[PDB]
Ligand binder design. Structure first.
Ligand SMILES: Cc1cc2nc3c(=O)[nH]c(=O)nc-3n(C[C@H](O)[C@H](O)[C@H](O)COP(=O)(O)OP(=O)(O)OC[C@H]3O[C@@H](n4cnc5c(N)ncnc54)[C@H](O)[C@@H]3O)c2cc1C
Ligand SMILES: Cc1cc2nc3c(=O)[nH]c(=O)nc-3n(C[C@H](O)[C@H](O)[C@H](O)COP(=O)(O)OP(=O)(O)OC[C@H]3O[C@@H](n4cnc5c(N)ncnc54)[C@H](O)[C@@H]3O)c2cc1C
Ligand SMILES: Cc1cc2nc3c(=O)[nH]c(=O)nc-3n(C[C@H](O)[C@H](O)[C@H](O)COP(=O)(O)OP(=O)(O)OC[C@H]3O[C@@H](n4cnc5c(N)ncnc54)[C@H](O)[C@@H]3O)c2cc1C
Ligand SMILES: NC(=O)c1ccc[n+]([C@@H]2O[C@H](COP(=O)([O-])OP(=O)(O)OC[C@H]3O[C@@H](n4cnc5c(N)ncnc54)[C@H](OP(=O)(O)O)[C@@H]3O)[C@@H](O)[C@H]2O)c1
Ligand SMILES: NC(=O)c1ccc[n+]([C@@H]2O[C@H](COP(=O)([O-])OP(=O)(O)OC[C@H]3O[C@@H](n4cnc5c(N)ncnc54)[C@H](OP(=O)(O)O)[C@@H]3O)[C@@H](O)[C@H]2O)c1
Ligand SMILES: NC(=O)c1ccc[n+]([C@@H]2O[C@H](COP(=O)([O-])OP(=O)(O)OC[C@H]3O[C@@H](n4cnc5c(N)ncnc54)[C@H](OP(=O)(O)O)[C@@H]3O)[C@@H](O)[C@H]2O)c1
Ligand code: HEM
Ligand code: HEM
Ligand code: HEM
Ligand SMILES: CCCCCC(=O)OC[C@H](COP(=O)(O)O)OC(=O)CCCCC
Ligand SMILES: CCCCCC(=O)OC[C@H](COP(=O)(O)O)OC(=O)CCCCC
Ligand SMILES: CCCCCC(=O)OC[C@H](COP(=O)(O)O)OC(=O)CCCCC
Ligand SMILES: *[C@@H]1O[C@H](CO)[C@@H](O)[C@H](O)[C@H]1NC(C)=O
Ligand SMILES: *[C@@H]1O[C@H](CO)[C@@H](O)[C@H](O)[C@H]1NC(C)=O
Ligand SMILES: *[C@@H]1O[C@H](CO)[C@@H](O)[C@H](O)[C@H]1NC(C)=O
Lengths: 436, 436, 436
């Protein structure tokens, strides 16, 4: 039966130690005081640091980085042992090297393996290990690394091997972050949903209060967020396919592809997935606010008054078939534009993305990605055809609030249309392999 | 070229043997009667048990557990061989030890590897291996276990290593179950959709038949299941976040977190995912029944009569703006409450759940999980404001059937609000690390 | 520090070489002209072919298959080296053996490992490696194959081991295909959406133009694709469960299950997933076109005229409760039939499909798959009950265009109902294990 020593009897020391007694391991704890040990599992004795290290070959140090000082006092006991470093830091970039690098320079005669820092101490105890299922294992000694990965499999976890000990810097960065790539689409969308809220409140509830004095302030429940949410979804969709256009222009002037993107475009290349899925989250709200139009009281009342007024005044509507074209056209373009929008979101799942090679992925994400941005722009051009862009449409001196949201998507489609023409695109094909 | 012996020429023996002839293996079957062999592949000879075992090093026993008796008669031939045990049982907990444990005690001088019990014999033959793609491999000998995993890769399958031979008890439990965790949310929801069907039939089709005698029995097609399905979705959502409240209370009285939950709460901790996804399945039905309201005949007729009666009787509706607030408010709260409801369901996918550490998962599942249960409770409080809870709302002595569904969600939100206050929550922070 | 030689300084040679300088490898390029080397990374010298191969043990040949001729001129240098073959072909089935097989016959004294052909040269450079994350590694020498997989882990990629070198034929087929299994459901659906477009244009816009001359040509925006898309979704759903019925008939005549399906049924067995997900894509369009009915101008106008005409002509509608049954029945059957339709699509995800054994998968995909095809057929039978199949329903001599779409689903449900009866099904149970 295997023996696993655990330095430190703290929170994660008890939780990892009690998980190993349930899987058939003889755990020998090591603490500063083996005399007074109140909370400990049943079949696990507690010894000194030098005494417990003489019993196993795998030593898990469940201590913080600041108290790594005593390991130099017993470096002749730790010769040939497997020291599993599990520690995290309180914040990113607190120390220059990682902990497993620093633990290797303290005890040079021992094989250091980074593991177990992703999982939490409560997930081992309660058994509610759902996102803390994978354990990232990295180390230099390949024989010692396969032995630690056998413990992770016997504890019901899934070891993901991360290579050599150089990858321990990124593993300690992993449990500290809270959506690091989603920060720029959240901040861009929040400053675009606040500006476009104050832009529609000034048009729809303030302008009918100054002129033609009426309350009209219920609009900011559904009727104003059904203008914020599609225009935010259309703008953020156009901000997705804009770096691929700016980078295509920036390669034509340079004449080569082997130079580096200018450090603001490169960070905005990597947030396209994050900008795309936030734009799907707002387009999905625009669908739900639109499909619930005929349930609202204002829509039932307005269609109720318009029918009664037509009933007592014997004038009639002669069914203009031109307006039946437009109202069935922009609704149809919005449905095809949302079907492909969802289809880009299905492919964004990390299991669907791995069952797809880079040609099938480029066909969905780029060929059917502009075709989303064409249909979602034609959905709001044909909707703009009913309003005609007349001078009776701007309230003070500021227009109908969707034509501001057509500046970025119609800019992307014009510049992309230049890059499709063979006087330019045949140069791009010769530049994706190398050119002067 | 490799040689793989297969004991037993039955259903899975032919299916696994014919799959290995298509991948470049020389398969030697072993049966009780090598003389009469009718159904067999082409390039695979059939020998005796002792004769076929002298030709390979990997022996796959395609026999049941009851006929393991003959292997003790030839235990001197099986020395050093790799015996791959593939057997299942007819029911869970039929024998005390697993089959691979029992196969190791019969032949102690052989390395036993559990594999191939997850896949079916038809999925190897027809090639329709879709859920039977992963093959769970476990065994003590690490050199013999990597050799069996090389066969699984060459057969187009994906070996998932499960550790030592102690994990063979759970692998044999795997192909027998049929949604074992989903049993409690299915039985709770079925006894809550049956009671709430008879509660709405008594109010909506029986009470208009006794008093004011009219048929009114078409309601149980859409109009009654649009009352069952949201209240079942709201109750099951409140039953998700109720164990996290009961466990928080039960840690304050104990003063420590290291004691065990009382065996009914612990089984209801593990079914939160299962209760949550069933509650999303009923909320998704409540969306589809609601968005199809203006297509129904009863809604078109009632809005048709109410307009014609207002047309021939010249009284008018003066557009009460107060009721335009409420009807745009509970509809908006239902959309935000369903958007985050879906967002919890996207994170529940086992590929999205693994691309997310436990802080980003706790932010979605708990911070944005109560915020779902707040918005979905405020969606049905504001809907209850239109009905005012007047005494003309209860039919015999029993109320309007959604206020029964507000008992559990408003209980969770009150007790959670006590646990947020810093006179209690600062004790919870000191108790998630250890306290007296 | 490790040394990795790369033959060939081309497009993928620079991209893979610059990725390895960023991970702590000393890369030594090999080219035909080490004198003139313009584009190259900083810390990577360029030598001759025989000179650079004498410095490392891992040699990555970044050259095409046609220029493999020079490796026979230096086969005494490549003894014991690990030659990583990364090449692709311009088209499928261009050469009889794969490249890694052909590279092994050129240099017999070297271990050949196929890797890196899935990823692209731009994904290494730009860092936008999203679908080119997995690297398929296969080779005969297990010690050399684990060494190449350590490079793939250190480059931030994920090595998927594919077994021996026999699997290199399928890995070179992998980056060339563009949805190979989706071709038959795309071509079947396109020839069924074109025929059913011309069938509804002849009924709905040509027949009201010849008789009772009116424009009526706006129908082909929403109103005609809301007839194409559900009938295509219902037909393709019936074409899913039809091979399982034809194969069940074809096993009863044969009397055994061990014979081979006749090569058109076998290719249509494998496209059931592909036919099923395309049928979900059209049913999801039928939902979105249907839920947007009360927003269209034609529906608002027609319900506006029908109310005003009822307001000025004092006749009334007495609320036939029979038509309130039917219109709430087929709408309810369409919602239950679409809920299970989506539930089959959630299980089709390759992460949900792997978290499910073959009994839970057969319960969803087959037991709840016919129950989808029953409810979606009863959704269009009850919708056909409102139209009664009168002789005033066919326009010239051709019927109401959904009853053509009931031929295939009602054929499958009748023949499946024969196979459920125990005079037939007890023979199928005795034939799924072997019978004469
Ligand atoms: C809902 C949604 C989900 C999304 N999910 C994802 C996701 O999961 N992952 C993701 O990455 N994006 C995602 N996106 C973003 C979008 O799909 C990407 O932009 C897409 O992958 C490529 O778009 P592109 O037009 O910029 O093409 P790109 O190829 O990225 O950009 C074109 C330019 O890139 C350069 N380039 C491209 N290929 C090469 C080459 N072989 N050699 C040299 N230069 C080259 C050239 O300069 C070319 O002009 C998503 C978007 C949405 C709306
Ligand atoms: C649609 C949907 C999908 C869902 N999917 C999932 C899913 O995939 N997986 C899943 O697990 N749940 C899932 N849930 C359930 C829900 O998300 C969980 O309850 C959530 O993970 C945590 O909720 P909670 O408030 O109970 O928090 P919890 O943290 O589970 O409960 C709080 C209590 O737990 C204890 N506790 C928590 N953390 C610690 C700690 N570090 N140390 C000590 N004690 C601690 C304390 O007693 C604390 O008061 C889903 C729910 C829905 C509605
Ligand atoms: C939205 C959607 C998604 C889908 N996704 C998938 C998917 O991911 N993967 C997929 O495979 N299909 C998928 N399908 C197709 C459908 O689910 C399959 O047909 C289903 O897996 C089985 O259906 P079946 O009735 O043909 O059953 P089958 O079992 O495939 O066919 C029955 C016949 O198969 C033979 N047979 C079955 N089991 C055995 C056995 N043990 N021994 C001998 N003979 C046997 C017998 O002849 C039997 O009569 C999908 C369909 C839809 C609509
Ligand atoms: N959820 C988690 O707790 C979690 C999760 C992931 C990773 N980790 C990591 O696991 C390790 C355990 O930390 P923890 O959170 O569980 O807290 P902790 O173990 O309770 O406190 C740190 C441990 O250091 C030991 N130690 C030895 N000398 C010490 C000294 N001079 N001063 C203070 N302590 C000394 C202590 O045990 P003795 O005095 O008895 O010897 C003490 O148990 C940490 O590195 C942590 O980053 C924890
Ligand atoms: N879909 C599947 O079939 C499937 C799936 C997963 C796992 N398995 C497992 O694979 C194994 C094969 O079982 P099976 O379903 O395919 O049925 P089976 O093989 O047809 O019957 C059991 C086999 O035991 C052999 N055997 C040897 N001595 C025997 C004896 N005294 N009495 C009876 N049989 C004897 C028989 O072959 P000979 O008499 O010719 O030697 C017979 O082929 C089982 O353990 C099963 O749990 C099967
Ligand atoms: N996106 C990709 O580029 C990609 C992706 C996956 C796989 N691959 C594979 O990686 C390999 C590299 O090809 P590549 O696309 O990057 O084009 P390439 O390397 O620019 O051209 C082929 C290479 O062959 C070398 N070579 C040696 N003798 C040659 C000769 N007589 N004639 C022509 N070339 C000779 C050349 O380098 P020197 O003359 O300087 O020695 C040249 O760099 C290919 O096998 C490719 O299938 C490429
Ligand atoms: C289910 C599919 C969709 C339907 C039925 C739909 C329908 C509509 C309708 C009816 C309007 C007019 C709103 C009103 O009456 O005030 C509208 C506006 C709009 N839609 Fe959509 N839409 C859909 C999807 C999309 C998508 C995917 C986008 C792109 C992100 C989009 C962008 C817009 C924009 C920009 C407006 C104008 C916003 C305004 O100024 O009011 N829609 N949509
Ligand atoms: C798309 C989003 C949603 C919309 C538009 C919506 C709309 C509505 C409407 C209009 C009603 C009144 C039904 C009627 O007219 O008889 C209602 C009732 C209700 N909704 Fe929602 N809802 C949504 C999502 C949700 C969610 C996510 C929940 C929580 C599970 C929920 C819980 C309820 C409850 C409990 C009722 C009262 C049931 C009754 O007694 O009739 N809804 N909803
Ligand atoms: C959200 C769920 C669904 C709803 C509310 C729904 C509703 C309807 C409605 C109202 C119609 C009549 C269309 C019209 O007024 O012209 C219809 C037609 C039809 N539906 Fe559905 N449906 C649903 C899902 C499905 C599904 C999943 C299928 C099967 C693929 C299906 C198959 C059909 C067929 C075949 C027709 C007849 C097409 C025609 O001739 O017009 N539906 N549906
Ligand atoms: C508050 C927003 C939280 C959203 C969390 C989330 O969904 O992202 C988790 C992860 C994304 O994480 P990273 O790509 O690693 O940033 O999974 C997905 O790819 C999303 C696919 C979803 C496709 C439908
Ligand atoms: C009759 C109900 C059958 C449902 C089957 C199912 O969906 O669960 C399969 C599995 C769940 O299986 P377990 O978590 O292992 O119980 O995948 C999911 O996590 C669901 C995610 C779904 C998120 C949208
Ligand atoms: C133009 C159509 C492109 C569609 C691409 C696609 O979705 O398939 C990618 C892959 C399917 O690829 P293969 O099964 O390998 O053919 O993932 C899925 O299983 C789909 C699950 C989706 C379940 C919702
Ligand atoms: C209603 O429609 C009919 C034909 O569809 C038309 O003749 C009649 O004038 C309309 N009634 C109105 C517009 O009041
Ligand atoms: C219809 O609305 C107008 C203003 O919107 C109002 O003046 C008129 O009284 C309404 N007609 C009714 C209530 O019949
Ligand atoms: C409207 O409905 C009432 C009862 O709901 C009925 O008595 C009345 O006749 C209807 N008005 C019509 C049909 O014009």
């Amino acid at each position: 039966q295997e023996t696993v020593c655990i330095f430190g009897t703290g929170d994660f020391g008890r939780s990892l130690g009690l998980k190993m007694l349930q899987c058939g391991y003889s755990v020998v704890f090591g603490s500063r005081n083996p005399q007074k040990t109140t909370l400990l599992p049943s079949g696990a004795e507690v010894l000194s640091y030098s005494e417990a290290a003489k019993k196993s070959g795998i030593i898990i140090i469940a201590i913080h980085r600041e108290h790594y000082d005593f390991l130099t006092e017993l470096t002749e006991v730790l010769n040939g042992k497997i020291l599993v470093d599990i520690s995290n830091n309180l914040k990113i970039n607190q120390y220059p090297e990682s902990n497993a690098e620093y633990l290797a320079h303290l005890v040079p005669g021992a094989h250091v393996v980074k593991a177990f820092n992703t999982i939490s101490a409560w997930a081992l105890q309660s058994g509610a290990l759902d996102a803390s299922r994978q354990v990232f294992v990295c180390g230099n000694d390949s024989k010692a690394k396969q032995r630690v990965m056998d413990i992770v499999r016997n504890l019901g976890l899934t070891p993901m091997d991360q290579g050599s000990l150089m990858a321990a810097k990124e593993i300690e960065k992993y449990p500290l972050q809270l959506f690091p790539m989603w920060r720029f689409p959240f901040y861009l969308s929040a400053v675009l949903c606040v500006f476009l809220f104050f832009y529609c409140v000034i048009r729809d509830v303030i302008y009918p209060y100054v002129y033609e004095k009426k309350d009209n302030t219920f609009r900011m429940a559904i009727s104003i967020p059904n203008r914020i949410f599609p225009i935010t979804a259309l703008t953020l969709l156009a901000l997705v396919y804009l770096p691929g256009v700016i980078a295509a222009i920036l390669q034509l002037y340079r004449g080569t592809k082997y130079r580096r993107f200018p450090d603001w475009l490169d960070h905005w290349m990597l947030c396209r997935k994050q900008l795309g899925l936030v734009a799907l989250g707002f387009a999905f709200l625009h669908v739900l606010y639109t499909l619930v139009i005929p349930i609202r009281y204002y829509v039932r009342w307005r269609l109720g008054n318009l029918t009664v007024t037509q009933a007592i005044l014997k004038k009639e509507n002669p069914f203009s078939t031109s307006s039946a074209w437009l109202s069935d056209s922009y609704v149809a373009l919005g449905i095809l534009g949302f079907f492909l929008f969802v289809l880009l979101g299905i492919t964004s799942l990390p299991s669907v993305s791995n069952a797809v090679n880079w040609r099938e992925f480029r066909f969905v994400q780029s060929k059917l990605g502009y075709l989303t941005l064409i249909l979602c722009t034609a959905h709001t051009l044909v909707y703009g055809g009913k309003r005609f862009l007349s001078p009776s449409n701007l309230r003070w001196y500021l227009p109908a609030a969707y034509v501001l949201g057509l500046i970025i998507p119609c800019t992307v489609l014009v510049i992309k249309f230049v890059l499709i023409m063979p006087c330019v695109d045949n140069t791009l094909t010769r530049i994706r392999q190398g050119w002067e």
